[PDB]
């Protein structure tokens, strides 16, 4: 009764053919171009909505507290003294602690004067934690532009690659996002 000996050798040779096939198809993975976004020299561009570091304009601020009452932890320290010579609110030393911030930009949407805008800046690492307390002149700085650094080849991620492209590595020369924009169908139809 050799029905379990030939089945044994059949299971062995089927596993051997499976290992040979999987070894042939893992050898076809080495020929593919690596999808690695090589960070310090290939900083990938964030999208047009990113919610990075919050930017603040000290002159466009009516010194309300809507940016505090919509923040989930009431984080922005806005303090004002009322000047009865002018009878306005007169902000002094706005600040946001970016070690406590969760970067939801609730304060950006519910800003009545469009004072708080959000940036593309995410490289905010510090050695001291208390350096993350950005005051009104610290967070009123112009953010780091990824496409204007002469050591970075910037990469559009997936939603800005035109209409058939999956990875932004083979891009020849700055091809746009997907196609037409609402200033085209107004000319079309």
């Amino acid at each position: 009764f050799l029905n379990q000996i030939t089945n044994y050798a059949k299971e062995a040779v089927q596993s051997a053919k499976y290992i040979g096939q999987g070894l042939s198809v893992t050898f076809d993975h080495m020929r593919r171009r690596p999808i690695t976004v090589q960070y310090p020299y290939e900083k990938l561009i964030p999208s047009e909505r990113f919610r990075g570091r919050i930017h603040f304009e000290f002159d466009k601020c009516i010194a309300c507290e809507v940016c505090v009452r919509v923040c989930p932890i009431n984080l922005p320290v806005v303090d004002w003294v009322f000047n009865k010579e002018l009878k306005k609110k007169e902000l002094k030393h706005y600040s946001i602690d970016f070690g406590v911030c969760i970067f939801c930009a609730n304060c950006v949407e519910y800003c009545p004067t469009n004072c708080l805008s959000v940036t593309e800046e995410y490289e905010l690492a510090t050695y001291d934690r208390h350096e993350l307390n950005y005051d009104s002149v610290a967070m009123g700085r112009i953010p780091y532009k990824v496409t204007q650094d002469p050591m970075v080849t910037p990469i559009r991620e997936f939603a800005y690659l035109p209409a058939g492209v999956m990875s932004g590595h083979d891009l020849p020369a700055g091809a746009q996002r997907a196609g037409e924009r609402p200033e085209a169908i107004a000319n079309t139809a």
């Binding site: 080495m30 020929r31 171009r33 020299y41 204007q148 650094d149 002469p150 050591m151 970075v152 080849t153």
Partner: protein, 73 residues
Amino acid sequence: VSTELLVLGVYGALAGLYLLVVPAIVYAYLNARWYVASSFERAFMYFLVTFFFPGLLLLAPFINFRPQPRSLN
């Protein structure tokens, strides 16, 4: 010229090739075709790293395989 000295000369030439010359050629081949290489060519250049590895280790703190600064224009 003595033939013992010529055998030592081809020993020194083979050592200078194995440690300095062809490791520099392998480095100049690897900042060259690495992505245009196939799987078999990748196995061949990995063999070239394997065989000339003491020469690649000697030449390692002197090559600067960082990307060049961009033009921004």
